Design a protein around this ligand. Structure first.
Ligand SMILES: Nc1ncnc2c1ncn2[C@@H]1O[C@H](COP(=O)(O)OP(=O)(O)OP(=O)(O)O)[C@@H](O)[C@H]1O
Ligand SMILES: Nc1ncnc2c1ncn2[C@@H]1O[C@H](COP(=O)(O)OP(=O)(O)OP(=O)(O)O)[C@@H](O)[C@H]1O
Lengths: 269, 269
């Protein structure tokens, strides 16, 4: 049917397959024009799409040119001097950045959803690497990172990097805006993992506790010692967890600062 | 008539009008499904369009954290071992990458706010405010701003702030790098508005005329004249216009400097 040709084409492009439909330009009916205009429209949308897509994948390669020189450099230090414990942390951060750039590349070219690359993963595997790197950062800023309860072989379903980043942020946010201590508490039950990250520093006014989770938004109070302050962090967190069927809340910490709590459901086979 | 609803909707979205068409969900005909699937498709295409923007703001944000751990690491190598010739290269690459990310974060902060509202707008309404403020800036730096032809009630469809900013930059770049005069020329035809911005100042070598539009690229010649910062300006411009179904080119100005030409299609309906 000519009505069915359009149903099928509109539902196909909606998936993300902006390929031409010659099917809609068949039959000299009143529909030839609705099909030729739809065919024009896919190339029009493709034209608009491959614009953000290219001058993304462009940003990608110019970020790669100084990383490659950094990676080239570290590798030459290793050959001259030894295998310093710090060379390893510089090395692995370059490796960590190299993947995030190839993520800026593959995810631009995809231009679709469901690309969530969701797998089965254990809580202990997921955030161990996170916590270790967080613990290191504390020593460097002379603050105390105490993890009251560690994560265990607790099952989860979703994007590892997405969840990794959710906590990575919560803890760094806690690390930054604290005074001297950060406490991370894992909790597990028949329904889900409950991460609670407490800080030493100043809290956030009860009214602003909801606002923080707004993208590109920072509290007026923290806006007077800003520096490396964007306002992105917690809005990313909120999404990652909410799309992982869980929730995130901001409370008043008994440590005197702010409490962030992430709840995530367990993966049940 | 149900065939005409689709002609009109497909030709409207093709122009960037990703707004919902309730018209296609009228009449309990065989077309209700082709219209409901088309309506689903616009929100699907809008979701894709916005995602590519969110992706960058997120990837740039998360790229900042392993750098910090790099930068933390290098700084600790310096304290343990010496000031290795290679450590300097690793150090300066991290510096360049961080500066890039810092302003890559600034760009996507604006782009999200610029790409907030999509709508029908007249060329005269859009860039008048821009040009007036540009004209004022010229008097203040003792330069001449002459607008050979003003914009008229010419129809356009897209983000006002996105397009506003595209020209705002082209003219300011023209203003900065000029010696004494800046000429802006509007032109309109049955197909589109053609803005041409000419500068008195030094031009750009024919080989570098393509390079300029690269993110972070700032010509070696005009890297000594101004302390600057990014090089994103023209790379942002290129995207804004390219995603607004138009193009941007850099030619040799008859004013002796550089001329930039922005072509944008008219909104028809
Ligand atoms: N642990 C914390 N203690 C106190 N205030 C906090 C804490 N975490 C977040 N905030 C407040 O929430 C605001 C917004 O947080 P958000 O994650 O959205 O952005 P950001 O941390 O400021 O910046 P970035 O995007 O670089 O992470 C901060 O500016 C700060 O005022
Ligand atoms: N009108 C112009 N005349 C001469 N050179 C120009 C002109 N506009 C741009 N350029 C050159 O192209 C480079 C890149 O353009 P771009 O718009 O990114 O400017 P920018 O100053 O580097 O960055 P931004 O405008 O964001 O501050 C400039 O650094 C300069 O060398």
């Amino acid at each position: 049917k000519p009505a069915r040709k359009l149903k099928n084409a509109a539902d196909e492009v909606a998936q993300g397959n902006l390929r031409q439909h010659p099917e809609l330009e068949a039959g000299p009916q009143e529909f030839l024009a609705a099909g030729a205009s739809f065919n024009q429209m896919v190339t029009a949308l493709e034209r608009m799409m491959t614009s953000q897509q290219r001058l993304l994948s462009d940003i990608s390669h110019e970020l790669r040119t100084p990383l490659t020189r950094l990676q080239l450099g570290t590798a030459l230090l290793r050959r001259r001097s030894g295998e310093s414990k710090e060379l390893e942390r510089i090395e692995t951060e370059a490796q960590r950045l190299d993947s995030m750039i190839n993520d800026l590349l593959v995810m631009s070219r995809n231009q679709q959803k469901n690309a969530l690359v969701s797998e089965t993963i254990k809580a202990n595997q997921l955030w161990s690497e996170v916590l270790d790197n967080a613990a290191f950062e504390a020593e460097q800023m002379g603050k105390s990172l105490t993890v009251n309860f560690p994560p265990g072989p607790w099952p989860l379903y979703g994007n590892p990097n997405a969840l990794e980043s959710a906590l990575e942020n919560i803890v760094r946010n806690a690390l930054r805006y604290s005074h001297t201590k950060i406490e991370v508490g894992f909790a597990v039950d028949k329904d889900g993992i409950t991460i609670t990250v407490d800080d030493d520093g100043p809290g956030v006014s009860p009214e602003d506790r909801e606002q923080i989770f707004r993208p590109f938004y920072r509290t007026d109070e923290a806006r007077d010692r800003e520096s490396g302050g964007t306002g992105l962090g917690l809005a990313i967190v909120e999404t990652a967890i909410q799309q992982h069927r869980g929730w995130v809340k901001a409370e008043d910490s008994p440590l005197g600062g702010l409490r962030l709590v992430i709840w995530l459901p367990l993966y049940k086979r």
